[PDB]
Amino acid sequence: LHKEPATLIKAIDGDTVKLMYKGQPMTFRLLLVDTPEFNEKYGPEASAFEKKMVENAKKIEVEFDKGQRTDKYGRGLAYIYADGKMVNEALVRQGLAKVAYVYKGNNTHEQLERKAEAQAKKEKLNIWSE
Ligand SMILES: Cc1cn([C@H]2C[C@H](OP(=O)(O)O)[C@@H](COP(=O)(O)O)O2)c(=O)[nH]c1=O
Ligand SMILES: [Ca+2]
């Protein structure tokens, strides 16, 4: 895969971020994860975590996978990195997102995400605490 630069416009919620990509605004939905909605338990915490990660980064990068690049809602589908750290993995490792929406055409980092999830579960973090 490869990383491409982009710039932050705004963090939206735990698993969506609006970025200026090749000179146009795009809303990106993070591959392989599902955060609670803001109105649900852990939703504000997930939103805050994604926000801090992307706002505090000097270097934002988009990494598409090898399959579909946009969804039915017109969002871009990617792995997002903030100063070299993958937001998709970090959210799951903190127990603020479940591994979800794993489609075969875009599953490069599936194993990585499931490994993060298993450890968040062992540690009884956040969505896994009960
Ligand atoms: C992450 C992701 C979501 N989606 C779609 C599936 C869901 O469609 P349906 O809602 O129509 O079933 C929706 C979930 O988005 P959110 O979790 O942001 O709600 O986004 C994809 O099509 N591909 C993906 O890779
Ligand atoms: Ca969600």
UniProtKB/Swiss-Prot annotation:
Q: Where is this region: Disordered?
A: 109-130
Q: Which residues form the active site?
A: 29, 37, 75
Subcellular location, in the record's words? Answer: Secreted
Superkingdom of the source species: Bacteria
Residues binding Ca(2+), per UniProt: 15, 34-35
Residue stretches of biased makeup (Basic and acidic residues)? 109-125
Q: What is this protein called?
A: Nuclease A
Full-protein residues shown here are 89 to 224 of 231
